[PDB]
């Protein structure tokens, strides 16, 4: 039920990761020749690039945007063991405010934090060094301070955050393995090792939680040779389950991304096929469209 | 050439427009101060003011800085200010701290604040400085002049925190300059003693930046003097002369850059003087 289309965006070289803003206006493509391209969206619907510069030494891995309530802020992590904050100031230039080099290996992932917990950034290294950095000052973005850290004891590949915004909830972070869950307690004020689902010995490419929207059980997706969708039911001790094993990709799944409503999951594989998975009337999961990489 | 059909009772006595050129003011002996709006040409009546103790001589519109304000100096002890607030013309304040009948009302430069000078025919002066609550501060000085002192004018705000000055005259065939000191009481300085019979108009000239500050005078001797000063440190107020017209000279008004010194007097006409390169004042119309 999906109609394909092509966007008139001129890119000379390959692109790694694209991330949207909160409103649906201004992607953050950054890859290939160590460059960051912060495009936009005009009123007529066309896309015109309005930014460019050169990133750190290593190849740019991921780019993530920040909430509109704390200005225009980016956060990129490259192979050069550096995480770059690229806040825009006064106009159409981009100027740095910090650069963290506390990871001895190459930085593997950089994901922001939910709006309700403040302005926090989490960085994952290739050797399993995961540290959480807080920046309590909001009028200044040139300052930072590490809050807490955990011992992965493996090679971290991707991390994800819990978007739940209820008062009666505990924030958590799940880290891929190439597969555990943390629990930032209140009195201790540190992350933990509450539980970890053991159903995938295959390598993990990218994990991604699903939005809450007021339901009473969270959803986690794990990217492997088979697209996995699971559920967790709080009773703290969870009730880990597995409710999906669709593996029609015929290749290795690249990435898994979630919709605003927490209903439609998009998965991409190594066979050049992008497929969207949706729910049915009887709370069953079935494919609802496949698009070819060419078009 | 727009015309305003007069409709008062007695002979008119004054006229002065608004800052942007949108309104009028007509002091008279009919006690009416009927203001006319002249937008696009025509006659309306936004106010048909009334109420005084004598015929009104001189009106003086204040700066738009401080809202629509008009002043009156009737043959009275009245200095009434008419605020015209809430889209309706109405009385606001009066002050009778002068025994004789006032004859002059000249607003101060807008950089200082909202100060009015109105010297009566007793030989006194007054400053109605606005305070910031809705009350005035009226101060005076016991004596300034022998018998008259009916004309007062202000000096352009110049220099660097300000040294206020103004000019008077009309009693001792004279004119005096009052520079208030750092204490607050008006001191005095030189008096320009070069006139003949009886002076009436004591106006001044706007400044542009040129150090040549000038000042005119119209009198009953029939003579008009255009004083000059090379600077304020030499004080060489050298009296020149422009004409010796037969009748009495009433009023002298300058232009926005002092290239006209229009004169009106007892001859029931208007003369439009202007000075040439040689320094001699010649007529135009």
């Amino acid at each position: 039920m999906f109609v394909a289309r092509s966007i008139a965006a001129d890119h000379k070289d390959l692109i790694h990761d694209v991330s949207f803003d909160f409103h649906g206006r201004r992607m953050a493509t950054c890859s290939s020749d160590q460059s960051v391209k912060v495009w936009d969206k005009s009123e007529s619907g066309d896309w015109h690039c309005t930014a460019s510069w050169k990133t750190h030494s290593g190849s740019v891995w991921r780019v993530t945007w920040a909430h509109p309530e704390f200005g225009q802020v980016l956060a990129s992590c490259s192979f050069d063991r550096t995480a770059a904050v690229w806040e825009e100031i006064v106009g159409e230039h981009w100027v740095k405010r910090t650069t963290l080099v506390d990871s001895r290996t190459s930085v593997t992932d950089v994901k922001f934090a939910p709006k309700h917990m403040g302005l926090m950034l989490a960085t994952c290294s290739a050797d399993g060094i995961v540290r959480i950095y807080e920046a309590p000052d909001v009028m200044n973005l040139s300052q930072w301070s590490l809050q807490h850290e955990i011992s992965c004891k493996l090679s971290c590949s991707c991390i994800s955050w819990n978007p739940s915004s209820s008062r009666a909830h505990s924030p958590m972070i799940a880290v891929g393995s190439d597969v555990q869950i943390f629990e930032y307690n209140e009195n201790t004020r540190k992350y933990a090792k509450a539980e970890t689902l053991m159903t995938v010995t295959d390598p993990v490419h990218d994990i991604a939680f699903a939005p809450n929207l007021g339901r009473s059980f969270h959803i986690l997706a794990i990217a492997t040779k088979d697209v996995r969708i699971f559920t967790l039911k709080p009773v703290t001790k969870f009730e880990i389950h597995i409710v999906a094993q669709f593996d029609n990709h015929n290749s290795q799944v690249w990435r898994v991304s979630w919709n605003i409503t927490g209903t439609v999951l998009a998965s991409s594989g190594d066979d050049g096929c992008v497929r969207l998975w949706k729910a049915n009337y009887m709370d069953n999961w079935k494919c609802t469209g496949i698009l070819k990489g060419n078009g | 050439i727009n015309t305003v059909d007069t409709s008062h009772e007695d002979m008119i006595h004054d006229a002065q427009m608004d800052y942007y050129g949108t309104r009028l003011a007509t002091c008279s002996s009919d006690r009416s101060v009927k203001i006319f709006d002249v937008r696009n040409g025509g006659q309306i009546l936004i106010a048909d003011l009334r109420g005084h103790e004598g015929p009104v001589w001189q009106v003086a519109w204040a700066h738009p800085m401080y809202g629509n304000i008009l002043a009156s100096c009737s043959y009275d002890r009245k200095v009434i200010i008419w605020r015209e607030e809430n889209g309706t013309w109405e009385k606001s304040h009066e002050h009778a701290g002068h025994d004789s009948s006032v004859n002059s009302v000249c607003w101060a430069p807008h950089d200082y604040g909202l100060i009015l000078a109105c010297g009566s025919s007793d030989g006194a002066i007054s400053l109605l400085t606005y305070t910031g609550e809705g009350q005035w501060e009226v101060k005076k000085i016991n004596n300034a002049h022998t018998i008259g002192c009916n004309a007062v004018s202000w000096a352009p705000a110049v220099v660097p925190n300000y040294i206020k000055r103004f000019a008077s005259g009309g009693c001792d065939n004279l004119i005096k300059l009052w520079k208030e000191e750092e204490d607050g009481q008006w001191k005095e300085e030189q008096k320009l003693e070069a006139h003949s019979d009886w002076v009436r108009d004591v106006a001044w000239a706007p400044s542009i930046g040129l150090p040549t500050s000038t000042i005119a005078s119209c009198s009953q001797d029939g003579r008009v003097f255009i004083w000059t000063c090379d600077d304020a440190s030499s004080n060489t107020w050298s009296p020149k002369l422009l004409h010796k017209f037969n009748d009495v000279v009433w009023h002298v008004s300058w232009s926005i850059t002092a290239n006209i010194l229009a004169v009106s007097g007892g001859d029931n006409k208007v003369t439009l003087w202007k000075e040439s390169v040689d320094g001699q004042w010649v007529c135009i119309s």
């Binding site: 509109p68 309590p136 909001v138 009028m139 | 926005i256």
Partner: protein, 98 residues
């Protein structure tokens, strides 16, 4: 500039006076205090949050002196064009008291 004002053309007054050489409360949402500026001091956060798009603002901003609900100047055009009620539902007839 004074002459230009007197004529009735007044943008030109500011344009000319720009060349002269010689010189010439909002509550915070986190700590609930009087903030002097677009940026707070205690939490160092934004003090003015737009009451329409719920976003922090730091430039031109209208407001009601009575009810105290403000936002972007364009936003306060777009809402206040027709319907006269505070978009935060405080019951203020803002156009009557402002």
């Amino acid at each position: 500039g004074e002459i230009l004002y007197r004529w009735g053309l007044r943008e030109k007054r500011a344009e000319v006076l720009k060349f002269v050489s010689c010189p010439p409360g909002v509550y915070c949402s986190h700590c609930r205090s009087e903030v002097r500026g677009t940026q707070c001091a205690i939490c160092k956060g934004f003090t003015f949050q737009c009451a329409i798009c719920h976003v922090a603002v730091r430039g031109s901003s209208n407001f009601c002196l009575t009810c105290g609900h403000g936002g972007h100047t364009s936003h306060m055009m777009e809402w206040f064009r027709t319907q006269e009620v505070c978009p935060t539902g405080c019951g203020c007839h803002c156009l009557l008291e402002s």
